[PDB]
Design a protein around this ligand. Structure first.
Ligand code: SAH
Ligand code: TMJ
Length: 257
């Protein structure tokens, strides 16, 4: 937990979204796969509404590229102040912001609505209304009087829950906790690491709860969801860079019933 204090946003981005784990040219890379999962889901025109909340966004934005065209009010979050700042720098187009163009581009490519990436980024930057601190450990993750429209029509979270839970039970709770933020009949799009027990972020070393695909499924069920879709990406050996011990990545499309 306190370990997340030494968490360096730039070391994290560099380790996971810079080449080779970030190259999008090769179709069999985790990047193409993940953006594709997101794109396809939203393309079914079933996950929509007005407001959408991104849990534990960290310093990344990709997780919303295909999503931003379906929700006009978007709320980004994260426990660390450093991250919320790193996001602001990208959102305001301030200097030293991480470059996500490559991703915006591939997202536009995958969607195939002939959209240029500048337009896609413009839309995202516009629909992201706020960036609020959050804590998935508290029963009311966002707090008491949150500027964020509640309950949201949909939720999105990539690599958070399992990266902040010491064991399955915690994982389960933090899932129940955020579930409360989602309006019934709503949609949840969760991404995460499969069987990962640790990952580096600069000086900080995070101890994760290694979880499988069935454990993730069952956990979603227990928290009151119906698993619309669940896919797995087994990490190739060339993407095993030393920054962690992840085995694969998962994608879930759940709906609060
Ligand atoms: N208690 C907590 N509740 C919510 N987020 C937390 C948290 N403790 C740490 N975090 C944040 O969860 C993130 C895990 S890393 C995931 C980053 C990003 N969503 C991506 O897709 O890569 C970090 O940004 C960390 O600051
Ligand atoms: O899938 S990734 O290798 N990179 C990656 C993901 C998604 C896209 Cl679109 C491109 C690249 C990855 C992202 C985050 C984390 C980990 C791995 C393991 N550590 C916890 C956090």
């Amino acid at each position: 937990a306190s370990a997340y204090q030494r968490f360096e946003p730039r070391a994290y981005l560099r380790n996971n979204y810079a080449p080779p784990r970030g190259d999008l040219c090769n179709p069999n890379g985790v990047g193409p796969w993940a953006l594709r999962c997101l794109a396809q889901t939203f393309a079914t025109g079933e996950v929509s509404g007005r407001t959408l909340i991104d849990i534990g966004s960290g310093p990344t934005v990709y997780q919303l590229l295909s999503a931003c065209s379906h929700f006009e009010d978007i709320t980004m979050t994260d426990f660390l102040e450093v991250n919320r700042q790193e996001l602001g720098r990208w959102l305001q187009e301030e200097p030293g912001a991480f470059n996500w163009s490559m991703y915006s581009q591939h997202a536009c490519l995958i969607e195939g609505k002939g959209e240029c990436w500048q337009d896609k980024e413009r839309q995202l930057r516009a629909r992201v209304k706020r960036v609020l601190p959050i804590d998935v450990h508290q029963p009311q993750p966002l707090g008491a009087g949150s500027p964020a429209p509640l309950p949201a029509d949909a939720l999105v979270s990539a690599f958070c829950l399992e990266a902040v839970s010491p064991d399955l039970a915690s994982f389960q709770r933090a899932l129940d906790h955020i579930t409360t933020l989602l309006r019934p009949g709503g949609h949840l799009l969760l991404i995460g690491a499969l069987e990962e027990s640790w990952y580096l972020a600069g000086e900080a070393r995070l101890t994760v709860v290694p979880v499988s695909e069935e454990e993730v499924r069952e956990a979603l069920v227990r928290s009151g969801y119906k698993v619309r879709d669940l896919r797995t990406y087994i990490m190739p050996a060339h993407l095993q860079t030393g920054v962690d011990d992840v085995k694969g990545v998962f994608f879930a499309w759940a709906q609060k019933v």
